[PDB]
């Protein structure tokens, strides 16, 4: 296969030459002309209490008022953030859960973990109580992330080093995605629900399309595991959080990565990231117990959600972008405005 | 809440009942302890696809044992989710502080030798130990 390898190297050289003809600078090198956000002050406006273990994931409803969250006490809670009212409480199949999703119509929630099964629960039934609607089985390794496409399709990734697109009523896989040498940790749903980005413990991520079952590109440049990934709601970027003490932002049409966010006091990895509804406040959690509210266009400034005394697992903003929730190992959801 | 309306009282009462149920559930939860079995495990698995979660009791204390006897590779989210265990029975960035009880025939490591009900009794003792020091670390007494 000498000819094939040589032609692959020639294609790589062509790609690099095309890169050099267009790449000149970065966002954080030209966007400096925008007025820095400076010191921003955030404060708790509510404090959602009731979880009694480490909280691993939270997720907003689309109305921007209801919230689902999961904690390692094998429990899944739906909250009213306006009045601190608890709306629903679901006891799970087993403790070792890792991910949450909400249905953008409001009728369903789906969870998963080590037991190699993705569970799906119906909220709005005529019996006046929640019950398990489906259990998708067929993966062999632990399940990492899950995001509804609509009331009838879901997508998961697992320790199998594979991803799978599923149809809920049938109960059988309708698409499968292979090509990872290491365990996949998370993936992100696009705004239009037609493209996915999935990062894996091989210092790389991959772009997938549901209708094709074949990747378009792979992203590399980190040094260690990838625990966090999310989008920029324009649909043209996604931000990665690694265990090499760095966050990066990757672009799709640039054939590279856009931004790098790091500091020396971060001798640890990034537990989670998330975006601002307009695209000006990036949020990151750490093992240094802080939540840094990084800026995006300036790569230097920051704020803090000081008030957490343990590790910050998960943080997310609404669709109207007026509040922010953080769940942490301290077992408290904190609402910030 | 005299400012509220008629139905906010019903919503508040519902949230308070949910709180009550959560509290009772967590209170009954917080007692059971955890043993990560790896591998004298042959008699252990019988005296006390994927991985096996099992539940038993001993001496009025409720044990959960997790068997990963096929996991001989590097742990990505096994070892991150295994931070919450009180004893690793044996026959990185996470387990540099977890007591490793060891059977034959900071990270304190024991050794025991064994009709053979000791297989259980031994580890039971370790349980108490691996808890006691922790609580002393809370009271500044050690």
């Amino acid at each position, epitope marked *: 296969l000498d000819q094939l390898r040589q032609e692959a190297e020639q294609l790589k050289n062509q790609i690099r030459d095309a890169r050099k003809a267009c790449a000149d600078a970065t966002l954080s090198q030209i966007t400096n002309n925008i007025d820095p956000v400076g010191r921003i002050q955030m404060r708790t406006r509510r404090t959602l209490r009731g979880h009694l273990a480490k909280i691993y994931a939270m997720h907003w409803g689309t109305d921007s008022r209801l919230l689902v969250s999961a904690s390692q006490d094998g429990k899944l809670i739906i909250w009213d953030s306006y009045t601190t009212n608890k709306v629903h409480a679901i006891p799970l199949r087993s403790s070792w859960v890792m991910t949450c999703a909400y249905a953008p119509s409001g009728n369903y929630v789906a969870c998963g973990g080590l037991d190699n099964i993705c569970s799906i629960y119906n909220l709005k039934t005529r019996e006046g*109580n929640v019950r398990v609607s489906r259990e998708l089985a067929g993966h062999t390794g632990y399940l990492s992330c899950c995001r509804f496409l609509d009331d009838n399709q879901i997508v998961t990734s697992s320790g199998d080093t594979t991803c799978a697109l599923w149809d809920i009523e049938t109960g059988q896989q309708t698409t499968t995605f292979t090509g990872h040498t290491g365990d996949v940790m998370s993936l992100s749903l696009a705004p239009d629900t037609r493209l996915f980005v999935s990062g894996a413990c091989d210092a790389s991520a991959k772009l997938w399309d549901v209708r094709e079952g074949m990747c378009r590109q792979t992203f590399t440049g980190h040094e260690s595991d990838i625990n966090a990934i999310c989008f920029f709601p324009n649909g043209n970027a996604f931000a990665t959080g690694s265990d090499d003490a760095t966050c990066r932002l990757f672009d799709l049409r640039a054939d590279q990565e856009l931004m790098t966010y790091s500091h020396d006091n971060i001798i640890c990895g990034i537990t989670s990231v998330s975006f601002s509804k307009s695209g000006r406040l990036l949020l990151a959690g750490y093992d240094d117990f802080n939540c840094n509210v990084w800026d995006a266009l300036k790569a230097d400034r920051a704020g803090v959600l000081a008030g957490h005394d343990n590790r910050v697992s998960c943080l997310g903003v609404t669709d109207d972008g007026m509040a922010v929730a953080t769940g942490s190992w301290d077992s408290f959801l904190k609402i910030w405005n | 809440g005299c400012t509220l309306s*008629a*139905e906010d009282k019903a919503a508040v009462e519902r949230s308070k*009942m949910i709180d009550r149920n959560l509290r009772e559930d967590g209170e009954k939860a917080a007692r059971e302890v955890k043993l990560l079995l790896l591998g004298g495990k042959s008699t252990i698995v019988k005296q006390m696809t994927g991985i096996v979660e099992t539940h038993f009791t001993f001496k009025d204390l409720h044990f959960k044992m997790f068997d990963v006897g096929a996991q001989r590779s590097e742990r990505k989210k096994w070892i991150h989710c295994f931070e919450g265990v009180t004893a690793i029975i044996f026959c990185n960035k996470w387990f540099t502080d977890t007591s490793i009880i060891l059977f034959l025939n900071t990270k304190e490591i024991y050794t025991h030798f064994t009709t053979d009900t000791k297989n259980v009794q031994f580890v039971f003792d370790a349980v108490t130990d691996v808890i006691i020091k922790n609580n002393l670390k809370d009271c500044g007494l050690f």
Partner: single-chain antibody
Amino acid sequence: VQLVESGGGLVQPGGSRKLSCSASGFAFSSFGMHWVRQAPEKGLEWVAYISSGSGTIYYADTVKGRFTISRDDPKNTLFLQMTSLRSEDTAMYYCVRSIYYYGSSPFDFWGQGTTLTVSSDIVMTQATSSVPVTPGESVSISCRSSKSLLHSNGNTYLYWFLQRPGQSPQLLIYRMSNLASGVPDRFSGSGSGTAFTLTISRLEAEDVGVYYCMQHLEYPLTFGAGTKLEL
């Protein structure tokens, strides 16, 4: 979903009596209940309320002290006690299922009622008594509120129900804007504070009976005179 009432009949003047209801097909514990009255020739009239949890119980200003309400979750049963019955108590009596969290539908399932024969407050005003209609013709009904039922959060606790001949009432609209499950689309209706109007589009069939508007903004729960249609 089934609720079955019982304990009805005829009683001589003076004494006391009992009513009961048995439920089947839903999680009885997560619901509160209402007892509701209807006169043999007149409109509806609320009786009493029991809450999910048993911590709250509400009665009416007209027979307070004479009645009481209770529930039993282990068996999924509802009970009503009444004493010292006078002539003004002869009526039909219904039980209603209700639930309150953020976004639920209350008053959405009515039982079938039983007979019982014996030998300040906000005012809702129904516009008229009867309106002649023809098939396929758009219809409109209106009632008036003596107070601004609307609230600083957006709620407005006015309800729209329908009663076909020989049947039980059926929820049509809750909080004066929201359609219920299992109802056609052709029903609608809106309004502004103190003035509300139900609209029916393309009257087809099985829409003959009496229409009612209720309020829930504070206890007691008051009804209007009613509005019947003929065809």
